[PDB]
Amino acid sequence: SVKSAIIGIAGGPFSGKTQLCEQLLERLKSSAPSTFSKLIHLTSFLYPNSVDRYALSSYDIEAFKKVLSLISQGAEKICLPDGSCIKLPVDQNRIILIEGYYLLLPELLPYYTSKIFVYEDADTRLERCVLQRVKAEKGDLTKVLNDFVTLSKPAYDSSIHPTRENADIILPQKENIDTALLFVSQHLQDILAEMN
Amino acid sequence: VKSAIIGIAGGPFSGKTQLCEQLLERLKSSAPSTFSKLIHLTSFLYPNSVDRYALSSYDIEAFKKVLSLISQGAEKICLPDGSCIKLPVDQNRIILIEGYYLLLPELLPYYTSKIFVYEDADTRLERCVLQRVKAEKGDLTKVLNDFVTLSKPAYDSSIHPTRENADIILPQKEDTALLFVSQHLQDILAEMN
Amino acid sequence: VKSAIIGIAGGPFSGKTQLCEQLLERLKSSAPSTFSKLIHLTSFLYPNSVDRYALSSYDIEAFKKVLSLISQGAEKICLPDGSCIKLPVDQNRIILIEGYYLLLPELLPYYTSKIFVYEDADTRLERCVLQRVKAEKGDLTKVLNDFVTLSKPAYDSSIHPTRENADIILPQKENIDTALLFVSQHLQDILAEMN
Amino acid sequence: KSAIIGIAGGPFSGKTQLCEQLLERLKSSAPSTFSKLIHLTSFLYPNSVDRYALSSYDIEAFKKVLSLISQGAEKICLPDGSCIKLPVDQNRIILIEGYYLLLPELLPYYTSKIFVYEDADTRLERCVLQRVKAEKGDLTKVLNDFVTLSKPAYDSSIHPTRENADIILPQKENIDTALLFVSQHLQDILAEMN
Structure with a gap:
């Protein structure tokens, strides 16, 4: 009865996948308002008190698998390690957009209705x-560079990049x-036309 | 009055040609009322080019002018192939194009859609x-030599960097x-109607 | 008693073993009074490993012990495969080590120098x-399958990102x-500084 | 007698600083050996707004300078106006530094070929x-110069040459x-020269 579609949108640090997902969400609100649509951030599945938001080791992947299964099974409420709980209606079909670094782990691939990797070069990212952090928010340039290069770059090089070819669409x-x-x-x- | 141009690029032995042949047959079976045609960039090879992979073997400006004429709604286009195609002006037009160098910068503005079929070099x-050895029973050494000495420098230096000009990889x-x-x-067909 | 450790990493079928033997020739002919020998990371595989390419098949902690012992001047060192290496203690020693996973962050401090033999995927x-089809007359289909299904994921996910840990590519x-x-x-x- | 060392690398890879310090070390350590550092930017076409693009480089002029050093000519002048006198009574070590030193046509002229590799985000x-924190330039203009000019040049024309180096x-x-x-x-190399 209650059908759900899951779209996994992966990408490296600062690839703009969140903004891209908001734009897709606009189209979903305007073109399928009777279908429930929602964006979920993989960062809501960070372990509590994680220091490194980029590292794969900081993510509760099993909790994420459980949430994916509950969405596919037609569940009405899902709670995330964030502390957030999300009401999923049961009188509509649902399309859940999910956004984050580690969506395309092999272990996760069968849960998705569709799989996208936002590809951007390291310098553009x-x-x-x-x-964002220096020009707009007036942060300190050296600390921002160091956060990117010492923390985000090893994570991207070792764990995110090799999953990019698991996507259906890059x-x-x-x-x-x-x-x-x-x-x-x-x-x-x-997808929604076939789902509805 | 409307023409849609679909550029599907890809490296040597990426299967982009068969991909477009299949899309072409699907257009023939499902949309006969729309005019559909597949153009191969190899139609713009220079005469007796020994290297079909190398960018230098391609008359890129001739291809740009054929693209521009299709964009402007021309009724007849002639190729360096010597062949000429009539494109009807009493039908909407959907043109599939396939080749290595479709996504050079100067060509980008003419396409309705830009797709790059990506695979790793060992996969290709x-x-x-x-294909060439197990099916066509060619000599393994000569096939490997063609790939590595001719196709690989071409892909590495001239095809690969264009892949990010696509809208979709x-x-x-x-x-x-x-x-x-x-x-x-x-x-695209629905929007053009 | 001084020891220099050279870690030579590389992907599957990158020819690093052959290159290490060429380096060994130059060591034998140029510095015969320095003890030199090539060690293969494959001697640190767990018993009966089905996938020689996967990182999961390698006892990396045992490899760390062996590196530490070589640095400390040990004279006899046995490896998981059953091999024992006699390292003279009346000579200076240069140990070349060869394998897929040598240039892994945890291992970097043990090496005197670090090399990655780089080759593109298609040429590998x-x-x-x-080697395996034209020379050894193996089955082309099975060889291609071994490369693409086992060697390629191991390289893409675990070997490739270590390449920039090398001093020399x-x-x-x-x-x-x-x-x-x-x-x-x-x-x-390195030998001249050691003496 | 003659040594030509080509050190290539992408934009903002520090190959220039490395070559400068190598040249100064040569001045101190082998003063009897003639040492000179040639910058590929001395072969830029006039009024080049894009210093990164291959099309802004007079490559043919660079190959002719390479051949003249190989043949032992006594002066070669560069497109920027600098001239090099090569002594006939001395061994020579020519350091060369630039983006496009490892184009195929140019490979045979070098004694050694090195590529200083760094990832695009590191560069x-x-x-x-260097140009914002140290030299106090405008961040937006610096970023735009890197991303719109240096990046396309590197991605399409510098990067593919990198495996032509002997050593990366x-x-x-x-x-x-x-x-x-x-x-x-x-x-x-100097020991081999003596």
Whole structure:
């Protein structure tokens, strides 16, 4: 009865996957308002008091698998290690967008209806990091560079990057990605059309 | 009055050609009222080019002008092949194009969609030997030599860096890319109507 | 009693074993009074491992003990495979070690110097089948399957990201004589400092 | 008699600083041996807004300078106006540094071929630390120069040449380890010269 679609959107640190997911969510609100849609952040599954948000070792992957299964099974309430609880309606079909670094672990692949990897080069990602944290939020340039390079870079190199080819769709990031946005939104509309 | 151009690029032995042949047959079976045609970038090779992989073997400006004419709604286009195609002006047009260098910067603005079929070089070499050696019974050494001495420098220096000009990169698993791109063409056909 | 440890890593079918033997020749002929020997990381595999490429198949902690013992000047060291290595204590010693997982963060402090033999994936597969199919007349299909299904995930997930831990990355090609000479000169610089 | 050392690398990889310190070490340690550092930027086309792109480089002029040093000519002038006098009574060590030294056409002229490798985010970090934190330039303009000009040039034209090097030296934010490696290599070349 209650059908659910899960979209895993992975990517490296500062690849803009959250903004991309908000844009997809706009299309879902306007084109399928009777379908329940929601964005979930993999960071809500960080272990409590984790120091390194980039490292795979900081993520409760089993809790995430349990949440994925509960969504597929038609559950109405899911609670996350965050402390957050999410009401999932049972009088609508559901499409859950999920966003994070480690969505494409082999162990996780069978749970997704669709799999996307937001690909951006390391320098462009560092540029986004600097423009957000230094230019906009007036943080300290050296500390921001060091957080990126000493913490985010080893995590990306060892654990995130090798999962990128597990995606069905790799989205290369640019100044304007409107065409790729409509490819993906049309794909999600096709998913809901078959689901409904 | 409307024409849709779909560029599907990819490395040597990435299967992009068969991908477009299958999409072409699906257009023939499911949308005969729409004009569909597949153009191969090899139609723009220079005469008697020994190296089909190398960028230097391709008349890129001739390809840019054929693309521009298709974008402007031209009714007849002629190729360096010597062949000429009539594109009807009383039908919507959906043009599949396949080749190594479709995603050079100067060509990017003409496409309705830009797709790169991605595989790792060892995967592509495996495909190359399974076709050329196991099926065609070619000499393993000569096939490996063609791949590594001719196709690999071309891909490494001239094809690979264009992959990020695509709107969509399809990592190939050996069916997935075919389903995605056919659904994409259904959406494009509906929007063009 | 001084010891220099050279860690030589690389992917599957990168030719690092052959390169290490070439380095060994130059050590034998150039510094015969220094003890030199090549050790393979494959002697630290767990018994009856089905996947020789996977990191999970390697007793890395035993490898760390052996590195520590070599540095401490030990004379006899036995490996998980059953081998025992006699290292003279009346000579200085240079130990070349060869394998997939040598340049892993935890292991970096033990090496006197660190090399990664780099080769692209397609040329490594070419080496693989030219050895195993053209020379050894194995089955082309099974060889391709072994490379792509077992060697390739191990390399992509665990070997490749360690390559930039090397002091020297050696790009593989038909003629590596210039790079071979560079590395041999480096190793004799190490020996000259040791004496 | 003659040694040509090509040290290539991407934008903001520190190959210039490394080569400068190698040249100064050569001045102190082998003063009887003629040492000179040639910058590929001396072969930029006039009024180049993009110093990174291959198309802004007079490569043919660079190959002719390479051949003239190989043949032992006594002066070669560079497109920027500097001229090099090569003594006929001295051994010579020519350090060369630049993005495109490892184009295939140019490979045979070198005694040694080195690529200073660093990841693109590390090189952007070097660029920003040097030109924003140290030289007090505008962060947005520096980032735009790196990403819109240096990055396409590196990705399409510098990167693919990197495996033409004999030796790739991986580096992080500083250049000390590469400096020691190449310093010892130059000492071995000098010993061979005597």
